[PDB]
Amino acid sequence: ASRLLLNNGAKMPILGLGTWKSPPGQVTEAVKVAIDVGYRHIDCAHVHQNENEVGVAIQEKLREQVVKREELFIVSKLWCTYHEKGLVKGACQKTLSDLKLDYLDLYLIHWPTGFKPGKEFFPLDESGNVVPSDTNILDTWAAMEELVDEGLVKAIGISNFNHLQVEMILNKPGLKYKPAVNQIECHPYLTQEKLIQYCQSKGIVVTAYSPLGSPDRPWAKPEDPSLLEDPRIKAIAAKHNKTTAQVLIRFPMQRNLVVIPKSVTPERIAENFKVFDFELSSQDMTTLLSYNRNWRVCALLSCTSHKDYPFHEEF
Ligand SMILES: NC(=O)c1ccc[n+]([C@@H]2O[C@H](COP(=O)([O-])OP(=O)(O)OC[C@H]3O[C@@H](n4cnc5c(N)ncnc54)[C@H](OP(=O)(O)O)[C@@H]3O)[C@@H](O)[C@H]2O)c1
Known about the structure:
The chain has one domain (about 1-315): NADP-dependent oxidoreductase domain (TIM Barrel). Helix content is about 35%, strand content about 15%. It has helices at about 25-35, 50-65, 90-100, 135-150, 165-170, 195-200, 230-240, 245-255, 265-275, 280-290, and strands spanning about 5, 10-15, 15-20, 40-45, 75-80, 105-110, 155-160, 180-185, 205-210, 260. A hairpin with a 5-residue loop joins strand 1 and strand 2 (about 10-15). Helix 1 runs parallel beside helix 9 (about 265-275), helix 2 packs across helix 3 and helix 7 (about 230-240) crosses helix 8 (about 245-255). It is globular and about 55 Å long. Bound molecules: NADP nicotinamide-adenine-dinucleotide phosphate. NADP nicotinamide-adenine-dinucleotide phosphate (NAP) binds near residues 214, 264, 271 and 298. Pfam families: Aldo_ket_red (PF00248). It is found in: Cytoplasm. Belongs to the aldo/keto reductase family.
């Protein structure tokens, strides 16, 4: 539809606006335009370093009465340097301050990896490697569950968890709140059929991040594949008189995924909204799926020997 049902009874807008890499001085206007255009779901994160400026736009549209607060679906995520039981509430409350809300709709564990606490997002040792916390996924999940019981967040979820990491929360003794959502990377070059099949079979909603292949990721190099300019995908968009981005956004939606394309450009924020009015044939969907090449934009490459690195498992 336009919203999917979560295991807590709330409904989550199938389209949201991503805000990673959105400069603090453009994102306020970006979020204001999104909300005006009809977006009702914004994907945030403390590590983005722009939640204060996202929060300025949200407050403005609330006070303008363009939207009521219960119409909005705001998501953020707990960064890896706050996995300690004693740090989780404090990280949540900081995010709530910057965003200027009194609760979140969904709050995700950003990565399954815990890092040493401190002021660096990626703490390094003598030899320049990332310093891990000795915390585990289950301790952190218990801290998250508390935030539901105190009324700070309505739902809790995970991001970049492999199927065995999800299983481990699912089999936790005394598990009180199931993960509502697993936000993972997903597009025609990394189609994630096994992990999406698993999560959907557990009643867990999947959100596809980097739908367009994150052409603005910091580590981009030119040999790299570009979805937005794949001549095969352009042909499919030509056939529907749509843009290739509009096709890349409609693709997850028809797999019953939530999708969160990022833009700070007003015409593109608008273009990206115009995806509810057409449909890919099953032939187009199969063709799109056949393009997989197991290519990840985000492989958290500095943590490949972390005890909790998610991407050594098949899925
Ligand atoms: N949970 C995680 O670990 C994680 C990791 C990565 C991403 N995410 C979430 O997923 C969101 C989306 O992922 P992403 O930011 O990597 O990349 P993306 O959404 O795949 O691509 C964003 C890039 O595509 C461009 N773009 C937007 N609309 C376009 C259009 N219609 N035509 C051409 N180009 C277009 C943007 O340009 P302009 O802004 O220049 O318009 C920006 O350069 C993030 O912002 C974040 O909120 C989460």
